[PDB]
PDB file of C-alpha atoms (C1' of nucleotides) and ligand atoms in Angstrom:
ATOM      1  CA  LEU A   1      -5.400 -23.101   6.404  1.00 34.44           C
ATOM      2  CA  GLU A   2      -4.812 -23.646   2.228  1.00 34.21           C
ATOM      3  CA  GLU A   3      -8.634 -22.747   2.312  1.00 35.73           C
ATOM      4  CA  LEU A   4      -7.934 -19.137   3.479  1.00 36.18           C
ATOM      5  CA  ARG A   5      -4.100 -18.751   2.283  1.00 33.83           C
ATOM      6  CA  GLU A   6      -5.138 -19.711  -1.294  1.00 33.80           C
ATOM      7  CA  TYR A   7      -7.812 -16.810  -0.393  1.00 31.55           C
ATOM      8  CA  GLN A   8      -5.328 -14.322   0.598  1.00 32.60           C
ATOM      9  CA  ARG A   9      -3.836 -15.121  -2.207  1.00 34.28           C
ATOM     10  CA  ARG A  10      -6.681 -15.063  -5.050  1.00 34.75           C
ATOM     11  CA  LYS A  11      -7.811 -11.726  -3.379  1.00 30.02           C
ATOM     12  CA  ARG A  12      -4.139  -9.858  -3.802  1.00 29.26           C
ATOM     13  CA  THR A  13      -4.128 -10.795  -7.363  1.00 28.80           C
ATOM     14  CA  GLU A  14      -7.764  -8.759  -8.226  1.00 25.24           C
ATOM     15  CA  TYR A  15      -7.090  -6.094  -6.337  1.00 22.73           C
ATOM     16  CA  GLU A  16      -3.714  -5.320  -7.478  1.00 21.39           C
ATOM     17  CA  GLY A  17      -4.666  -6.414 -11.186  1.00 22.49           C
ATOM     18  CA  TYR A  18      -7.249  -3.147 -11.154  1.00 18.94           C
ATOM     19  CA  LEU A  19      -4.685  -0.631  -9.428  1.00 18.78           C
ATOM     20  CA  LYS A  20      -2.189  -1.549 -12.253  1.00 18.12           C
ATOM     21  CA  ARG A  21      -4.038  -0.425 -14.662  1.00 20.18           C
ATOM     22  CA  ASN A  22      -5.910   2.210 -12.582  1.00 18.81           C
ATOM     23  CA  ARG A  23      -2.948   4.013 -10.399  1.00 16.87           C
ATOM     24  CA  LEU A  24      -5.833   6.294  -9.468  1.00 16.31           C
ATOM     25  CA  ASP A  25      -9.230   5.567  -8.201  1.00 16.55           C
ATOM     26  CA  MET A  26      -8.435   6.298  -4.540  1.00 17.94           C
ATOM     27  CA  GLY A  27     -11.363   4.525  -3.028  1.00 17.37           C
ATOM     28  CA  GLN A  28     -10.339   1.166  -4.982  1.00 16.00           C
ATOM     29  CA  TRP A  29      -6.720   1.842  -2.395  1.00 12.86           C
ATOM     30  CA  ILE A  30      -8.812   2.458   0.248  1.00 12.36           C
ATOM     31  CA  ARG A  31     -10.836  -0.714  -0.506  1.00 11.26           C
ATOM     32  CA  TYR A  32      -7.697  -2.566  -0.194  1.00  8.32           C
ATOM     33  CA  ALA A  33      -6.198  -1.268   2.106  1.00  8.33           C
ATOM     34  CA  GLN A  34      -9.300  -2.111   4.516  1.00  9.59           C
ATOM     35  CA  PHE A  35      -8.934  -6.073   3.505  1.00  7.91           C
ATOM     36  CA  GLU A  36      -5.152  -5.983   4.867  1.00  9.32           C
ATOM     37  CA  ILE A  37      -6.514  -4.493   7.926  1.00  8.07           C
ATOM     38  CA  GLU A  38      -9.084  -7.104   8.437  1.00 10.92           C
ATOM     39  CA  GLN A  39      -6.456 -10.058   8.037  1.00  9.20           C
ATOM     40  CA  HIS A  40      -4.646  -8.518  11.121  1.00 10.21           C
ATOM     41  CA  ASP A  41      -1.697  -7.636   8.633  1.00  9.24           C
ATOM     42  CA  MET A  42      -0.832  -4.080   9.554  1.00  7.48           C
ATOM     43  CA  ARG A  43       2.517  -4.294   8.150  1.00  8.55           C
ATOM     44  CA  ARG A  44       0.778  -4.756   4.575  1.00  8.52           C
ATOM     45  CA  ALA A  45      -2.131  -2.526   5.621  1.00  7.61           C
ATOM     46  CA  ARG A  46       0.903   0.282   6.078  1.00  6.99           C
ATOM     47  CA  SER A  47       2.800  -0.446   2.528  1.00 11.38           C
ATOM     48  CA  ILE A  48      -0.705   0.218   0.750  1.00 13.04           C
ATOM     49  CA  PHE A  49      -1.571   3.418   2.191  1.00 12.37           C
ATOM     50  CA  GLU A  50       2.315   4.631   1.689  1.00 12.96           C
ATOM     51  CA  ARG A  51       2.137   3.173  -1.924  1.00 11.73           C
ATOM     52  CA  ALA A  52      -1.833   5.230  -2.065  1.00 12.74           C
ATOM     53  CA  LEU A  53      -0.151   8.803  -0.511  1.00 17.66           C
ATOM     54  CA  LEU A  54       2.397   8.447  -3.840  1.00 17.80           C
ATOM     55  CA  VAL A  55      -0.700   9.261  -5.781  1.00 15.90           C
ATOM     56  CA  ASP A  56      -2.110  11.861  -4.356  1.00  8.86           C
ATOM     57  CA  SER A  57      -1.416  12.939  -1.528  1.00 11.33           C
ATOM     58  CA  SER A  58      -4.080  15.876  -1.322  1.00  9.54           C
ATOM     59  CA  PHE A  59      -6.651  13.561  -0.928  1.00  6.96           C
ATOM     60  CA  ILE A  60      -6.834  13.974   2.873  1.00  8.91           C
ATOM     61  CA  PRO A  61      -9.906  11.404   2.881  1.00 11.20           C
ATOM     62  CA  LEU A  62      -6.984   8.775   2.387  1.00  9.54           C
ATOM     63  CA  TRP A  63      -4.970  10.654   5.215  1.00  9.11           C
ATOM     64  CA  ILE A  64      -7.638  10.452   7.806  1.00 10.65           C
ATOM     65  CA  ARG A  65      -8.212   6.977   7.228  1.00 11.24           C
ATOM     66  CA  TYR A  66      -4.948   5.539   7.568  1.00  7.58           C
ATOM     67  CA  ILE A  67      -4.923   7.573  11.125  1.00  7.97           C
ATOM     68  CA  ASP A  68      -8.289   5.373  11.745  1.00  7.90           C
ATOM     69  CA  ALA A  69      -5.893   2.431  10.582  1.00  8.82           C
ATOM     70  CA  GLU A  70      -3.653   2.988  13.505  1.00  5.60           C
ATOM     71  CA  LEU A  71      -6.215   4.531  16.417  1.00  6.72           C
ATOM     72  CA  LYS A  72      -8.514   1.242  16.128  1.00  5.80           C
ATOM     73  CA  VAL A  73      -5.367  -1.397  16.820  1.00  9.44           C
ATOM     74  CA  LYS A  74      -4.382   1.706  19.189  1.00  8.10           C
ATOM     75  CA  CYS A  75      -0.962   1.987  17.798  1.00  9.64           C
ATOM     76  CA  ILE A  76      -0.400   5.388  19.396  1.00  6.40           C
ATOM     77  CA  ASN A  77       3.187   6.496  18.080  1.00  8.33           C
ATOM     78  CA  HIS A  78       2.908   5.392  14.853  1.00  6.21           C
ATOM     79  CA  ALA A  79      -0.102   7.835  14.577  1.00  2.27           C
ATOM     80  CA  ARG A  80       1.677  10.488  16.476  1.00  2.00           C
ATOM     81  CA  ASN A  81       5.106  10.918  14.358  1.00  2.00           C
ATOM     82  CA  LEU A  82       2.463  10.738  11.418  1.00  2.00           C
ATOM     83  CA  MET A  83       1.199  14.185  12.035  1.00  2.00           C
ATOM     84  CA  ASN A  84       5.150  15.293  11.481  1.00  3.26           C
ATOM     85  CA  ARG A  85       4.716  14.337   8.228  1.00  2.40           C
ATOM     86  CA  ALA A  86       0.975  15.107   7.476  1.00  3.30           C
ATOM     87  CA  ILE A  87       0.547  18.497   8.621  1.00  6.40           C
ATOM     88  CA  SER A  88       4.084  19.218   7.741  1.00  7.76           C
ATOM     89  CA  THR A  89       2.556  18.272   3.983  1.00  6.00           C
ATOM     90  CA  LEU A  90      -0.580  20.318   4.066  1.00  9.37           C
ATOM     91  CA  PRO A  91      -0.459  23.406   6.712  1.00  9.91           C
ATOM     92  CA  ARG A  92      -3.659  25.277   5.255  1.00 10.46           C
ATOM     93  CA  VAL A  93      -6.340  22.282   5.485  1.00 11.47           C
ATOM     94  CA  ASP A  94      -8.365  22.770   8.637  1.00 11.87           C
ATOM     95  CA  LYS A  95      -9.268  18.963   8.928  1.00  9.61           C
ATOM     96  CA  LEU A  96      -5.904  17.717   9.614  1.00 11.21           C
ATOM     97  CA  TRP A  97      -5.165  20.136  12.655  1.00 10.03           C
ATOM     98  CA  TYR A  98      -9.038  19.056  13.665  1.00  8.90           C
ATOM     99  CA  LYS A  99      -8.343  15.558  14.175  1.00  6.02           C
ATOM    100  CA  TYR A 100      -4.716  15.656  15.994  1.00  6.46           C
ATOM    101  CA  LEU A 101      -6.009  18.161  18.024  1.00  3.92           C
ATOM    102  CA  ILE A 102      -9.747  16.355  19.485  1.00  3.87           C
ATOM    103  CA  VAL A 103      -7.576  13.041  19.314  1.00  4.08           C
ATOM    104  CA  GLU A 104      -5.129  14.399  21.614  1.00  5.98           C
ATOM    105  CA  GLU A 105      -8.214  15.592  23.809  1.00  6.76           C
ATOM    106  CA  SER A 106      -9.153  12.150  24.266  1.00  6.79           C
ATOM    107  CA  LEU A 107      -5.992  10.839  25.427  1.00  5.68           C
ATOM    108  CA  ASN A 108      -5.963  13.805  27.809  1.00  6.59           C
ATOM    109  CA  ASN A 109      -2.757  15.024  27.590  1.00  4.70           C
ATOM    110  CA  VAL A 110      -2.817  18.854  26.945  1.00  5.31           C
ATOM    111  CA  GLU A 111       0.508  20.074  27.570  1.00  5.17           C
ATOM    112  CA  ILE A 112       0.621  18.701  24.089  1.00  4.45           C
ATOM    113  CA  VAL A 113      -1.775  21.278  22.590  1.00  4.28           C
ATOM    114  CA  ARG A 114      -0.275  23.800  24.514  1.00  6.41           C
ATOM    115  CA  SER A 115       2.015  23.538  21.666  1.00  3.31           C
ATOM    116  CA  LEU A 116       0.269  22.220  18.601  1.00  2.00           C
ATOM    117  CA  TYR A 117      -2.142  26.158  19.015  1.00  2.00           C
ATOM    118  CA  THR A 118       1.348  27.713  19.496  1.00  2.00           C
ATOM    119  CA  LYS A 119       2.614  26.684  15.579  1.00  2.00           C
ATOM    120  CA  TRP A 120      -0.986  26.906  14.720  1.00  2.00           C
ATOM    121  CA  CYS A 121      -1.808  30.227  15.510  1.00  2.00           C
ATOM    122  CA  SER A 122       1.971  31.511  13.802  1.00  2.36           C
ATOM    123  CA  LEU A 123       0.734  30.176  10.699  1.00  4.79           C
ATOM    124  CA  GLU A 124      -2.021  32.744  10.772  1.00  3.78           C
ATOM    125  CA  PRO A 125      -5.377  30.351  10.055  1.00  2.38           C
ATOM    126  CA  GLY A 126      -8.385  32.553  10.308  1.00  2.00           C
ATOM    127  CA  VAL A 127     -11.394  33.051  11.852  1.00  2.00           C
ATOM    128  CA  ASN A 128     -12.893  29.415  12.480  1.00  2.00           C
ATOM    129  CA  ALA A 129      -9.473  28.000  13.841  1.00  2.00           C
ATOM    130  CA  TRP A 130      -8.684  31.353  16.127  1.00  2.00           C
ATOM    131  CA  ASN A 131     -12.444  30.943  17.709  1.00  2.00           C
ATOM    132  CA  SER A 132     -11.779  27.114  18.743  1.00  2.00           C
ATOM    133  CA  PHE A 133      -8.389  28.329  20.868  1.00  2.51           C
TER     134      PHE A 133
ATOM    135  C1'   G B   1      73.441 -20.225 -26.371  1.00  2.00           C
ATOM    136  C1'   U B   2      76.256 -15.769 -27.933  1.00  2.00           C
ATOM    137  C1'   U B   3      79.862 -12.488 -26.942  1.00  2.00           C
ATOM    138  C1'   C B   4      83.791  -8.886 -23.893  1.00  3.74           C
ATOM    139  C1'   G B   5      87.064 -10.031 -20.166  1.00  2.00           C
ATOM    140  C1'   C B   6      90.420 -13.040 -17.420  1.00  3.74           C
ATOM    141  C1'   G B   7      93.088 -18.032 -15.288  1.00  2.00           C
ATOM    142  C1'   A B   8      95.573 -22.848 -16.902  1.00  2.00           C
ATOM    143  C1'   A B   9      96.041 -26.982 -19.735  1.00  2.00           C
ATOM    144  C1'   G B  10      97.571 -29.666 -24.898  1.00  2.00           C
ATOM    145  C1'   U B  11      99.002 -27.780 -29.409  1.00  2.00           C
ATOM    146  C1'   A B  12     102.352 -24.087 -29.649  1.00  2.00           C
ATOM    147  C1'   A B  13     106.241 -17.897 -33.602  1.00  2.00           C
ATOM    148  C1'   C B  14     100.703 -16.840 -28.381  1.00  2.00           C
ATOM    149  C1'   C B  15      97.430 -19.866 -32.648  1.00  2.00           C
ATOM    150  C1'   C B  16      93.409 -23.195 -32.551  1.00  2.00           C
ATOM    151  C1'   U B  17      91.048 -26.930 -28.938  1.00  2.00           C
ATOM    152  C1'   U B  18      89.343 -27.696 -23.959  1.00  2.00           C
ATOM    153  C1'   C B  19      88.508 -26.989 -18.256  1.00  2.00           C
ATOM    154  C1'   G B  20      87.320 -23.654 -14.669  1.00  2.00           C
ATOM    155  C1'   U B  21      85.946 -18.310 -13.599  1.00  2.00           C
ATOM    156  C1'   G B  22      83.677 -11.817 -13.871  1.00  2.00           C
ATOM    157  C1'   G B  23      80.612  -8.995 -15.930  1.00  2.00           C
ATOM    158  C1'   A B  24      76.938  -8.555 -20.213  1.00  2.00           C
ATOM    159  C1'   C B  25      72.594  -9.765 -23.533  1.00  2.00           C
ATOM    160  C1'   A B  26      67.270 -11.748 -23.122  1.00  2.00           C
ATOM    161  C1'   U B  27      62.400 -11.316 -17.820  1.00  2.00           C
ATOM    162  C1'   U B  28      56.593 -13.238 -15.127  1.00  2.00           C
ATOM    163  C1'   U B  29      51.916 -16.144 -20.327  1.00  2.00           C
ATOM    164  C1'   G B  30      46.914 -17.753 -19.735  1.00  2.00           C
ATOM    165  C1'   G B  31      41.397 -17.774 -16.992  1.00  2.00           C
ATOM    166  C1'   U B  32      34.524 -13.772 -15.527  1.00  2.00           C
ATOM    167  C1'   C B  33      35.281 -19.840 -19.216  1.00  2.00           C
ATOM    168  C1'   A B  34      36.573 -27.654 -16.427  1.00  2.00           C
ATOM    169  C1'   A B  35      34.826 -32.929 -21.213  1.00  2.00           C
ATOM    170  C1'   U B  36      26.474 -35.609 -21.269  1.00  2.00           C
ATOM    171  C1'   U B  37      21.782 -36.389 -16.760  1.00  2.00           C
ATOM    172  C1'   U B  38      21.403 -32.059 -11.236  1.00  2.00           C
ATOM    173  C1'   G B  39      21.044 -24.385 -12.889  1.00  2.00           C
ATOM    174  C1'   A B  40      16.958 -24.427 -17.100  1.00  2.00           C
ATOM    175  C1'   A B  41      16.194 -23.219 -26.419  1.00  2.00           C
ATOM    176  C1'   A B  42      11.716 -24.050 -28.391  1.00  2.00           C
ATOM    177  C1'   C B  43       8.428 -26.590 -31.384  1.00  2.00           C
ATOM    178  C1'   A B  44       4.922 -30.560 -33.365  1.00  2.00           C
ATOM    179  C1'   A B  45       1.511 -33.801 -31.357  1.00  2.00           C
ATOM    180  C1'   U B  46      -2.167 -35.436 -28.515  1.00  2.00           C
ATOM    181  C1'   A B  47      -6.331 -32.966 -24.951  1.00  2.00           C
ATOM    182  C1'   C B  48      -9.624 -29.145 -23.839  1.00  2.00           C
ATOM    183  C1'   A B  49     -11.447 -24.163 -25.013  1.00  2.00           C
ATOM    184  C1'   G B  50     -13.102 -20.939 -28.980  1.00  2.00           C
ATOM    185  C1'   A B  51     -11.548 -15.557 -33.126  1.00  2.00           C
ATOM    186  C1'   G B  52     -14.159  -7.829 -31.091  1.00  2.00           C
ATOM    187  C1'   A B  53     -18.785  -4.375 -31.092  1.00  2.00           C
ATOM    188  C1'   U B  54     -24.315  -6.713 -32.874  1.00  2.00           C
ATOM    189  C1'   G B  55     -30.590  -8.335 -33.312  1.00  2.00           C
ATOM    190  C1'   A B  56     -27.247 -10.490 -37.068  1.00  2.00           C
ATOM    191  C1'   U B  57     -22.469 -10.369 -39.952  1.00  2.00           C
ATOM    192  C1'   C B  58     -18.358  -7.848 -41.101  1.00  2.00           C
ATOM    193  C1'   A B  59     -13.619  -2.916 -42.392  1.00  2.00           C
ATOM    194  C1'   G B  60     -11.190  -1.063 -38.745  1.00  2.00           C
ATOM    195  C1'   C B  61      -7.815   2.281 -36.026  1.00  2.00           C
ATOM    196  C1'   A B  62      -5.755   3.752 -31.333  1.00  2.00           C
ATOM    197  C1'   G B  63      -5.543   4.846 -25.368  1.00  2.00           C
ATOM    198  C1'   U B  64      -3.903   2.042 -20.956  1.00  2.00           C
ATOM    199  C1'   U B  65      -0.568  -1.998 -18.426  1.00  2.00           C
ATOM    200  C1'   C B  66       5.703  -4.158 -13.204  1.00  2.00           C
ATOM    201  C1'   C B  67       2.334  -7.797 -21.946  1.00  2.00           C
ATOM    202  C1'   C B  68       5.284  -9.610 -26.085  1.00  2.00           C
ATOM    203  C1'   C B  69       6.427 -11.823 -31.715  1.00  2.00           C
ATOM    204  C1'   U B  70       8.127 -11.194 -36.844  1.00  2.00           C
ATOM    205  C1'   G B  71      10.637  -6.687 -38.842  1.00  2.00           C
ATOM    206  C1'   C B  72      17.549  -3.419 -40.436  1.00  2.00           C
ATOM    207  C1'   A B  73      12.910  -0.457 -38.899  1.00  2.00           C
ATOM    208  C1'   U B  74      10.340   5.634 -35.758  1.00  2.00           C
ATOM    209  C1'   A B  75       7.081   0.977 -41.278  1.00  2.00           C
ATOM    210  C1'   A B  76       3.663  -2.450 -41.641  1.00  2.00           C
ATOM    211  C1'   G B  77       1.835  -6.883 -39.907  1.00  2.00           C
ATOM    212  C1'   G B  78       0.603 -10.838 -35.310  1.00  2.00           C
ATOM    213  C1'   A B  79      -7.598 -12.624 -33.052  1.00  2.00           C
ATOM    214  C1'   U B  80      -9.043  -4.892 -35.138  1.00  2.00           C
ATOM    215  C1'   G B  81      -1.867  -8.949 -31.972  1.00  2.00           C
ATOM    216  C1'   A B  82      -2.707  -9.842 -26.177  1.00  2.00           C
ATOM    217  C1'   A B  83      -4.813  -8.678 -21.250  1.00  2.00           C
ATOM    218  C1'   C B  84      -7.843  -5.022 -19.154  1.00  2.00           C
ATOM    219  C1'   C B  85     -15.364  -4.430 -19.790  1.00  2.00           C
ATOM    220  C1'   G B  86     -14.605  -7.254 -13.115  1.00  2.00           C
ATOM    221  C1'   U B  87     -16.021  -4.474  -7.506  1.00  2.00           C
ATOM    222  C1'   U B  88     -17.370   0.159  -5.520  1.00  2.00           C
ATOM    223  C1'   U B  89     -20.725   2.595   1.998  1.00  2.00           C
ATOM    224  C1'   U B  90     -17.525   7.589   7.111  1.00  2.00           C
ATOM    225  C1'   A B  91     -13.566  15.157   6.024  1.00  2.00           C
ATOM    226  C1'   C B  92     -19.616  14.121   7.096  1.00  2.00           C
ATOM    227  C1'   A B  93     -23.553  17.791   9.684  1.00  2.00           C
ATOM    228  C1'   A B  94     -27.391  21.187  10.857  1.00  2.00           C
ATOM    229  C1'   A B  95     -32.392  21.581  12.116  1.00  2.00           C
ATOM    230  C1'   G B  96     -36.732  18.752  14.719  1.00  2.00           C
ATOM    231  C1'   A B  97     -40.204  15.275  16.898  1.00  2.00           C
ATOM    232  C1'   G B  98     -40.850  11.027  20.450  1.00  2.00           C
ATOM    233  C1'   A B  99     -39.042   7.683  23.823  1.00  2.00           C
ATOM    234  C1'   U B 100     -35.334   6.477  27.564  1.00  2.00           C
ATOM    235  C1'   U B 101     -33.333   9.124  31.618  1.00  2.00           C
ATOM    236  C1'   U B 102     -30.177  12.170  35.597  1.00  2.00           C
ATOM    237  C1'   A B 103     -27.598  16.765  39.426  1.00  2.00           C
TER     238        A B 103
HETATM  239 MG1   MG C 201      -3.705  -3.264 -30.611  1.00  2.00          MG
HETATM  240 MG1   MG C 202      -1.647  -3.636 -34.900  1.00  2.00          MG
END
RNA sequence: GUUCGCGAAGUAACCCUUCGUGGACAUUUGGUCAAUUUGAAACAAUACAGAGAUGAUCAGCAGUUCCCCUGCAUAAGGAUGAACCGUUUUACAAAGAGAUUUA
């Protein structure tokens, strides 16, 4: 196991030595987050995604891959109440509204999208969103 | 222990000693800390490594880090003080062509 244990120790010093000097570079935050997903450790992986939302919270390719981290392992309520934070942060962004719709379409409960489009039409989006409703 | 009053004793022109009693006066220090190995100075020596850029040899000054030492120091030095010069795949589709395939 120490073939793996000092492996996991050595890799975490290499990415966090880099992110120490570059709080930016959102691509390295995602890559170091994906390393901890493959270690089957979602407690550490959620930390890196929360630490990276502090640096930028408008870089929505970070948001979407944190939803994808939660749905691939099929932890569903952690991706559900995440959306109480995500679209209450950025109500104007299209893709954060669309992805929380289509994921609910594949989970097949249309009572939930009956209240989503209720707010999302009270919010007055524009032509491409009203037509999908 | 002092002093004021009281009660006696002995000496006694009520004075000096001594014993027994009431009140007064004076009133809460210090520790975050126990006296060698097991609750934490450092260096020197030895061994290895070697002090930027570049074809090569050199003056340097910065910035970045959950890096410091010397110095009164917001000065100036400390290899241009040190560590950084590694790794990098999805907001993702539009158009078409073939093939597979089913009411
Ligand atoms: Mg310097
Ligand atoms: Mg200097």
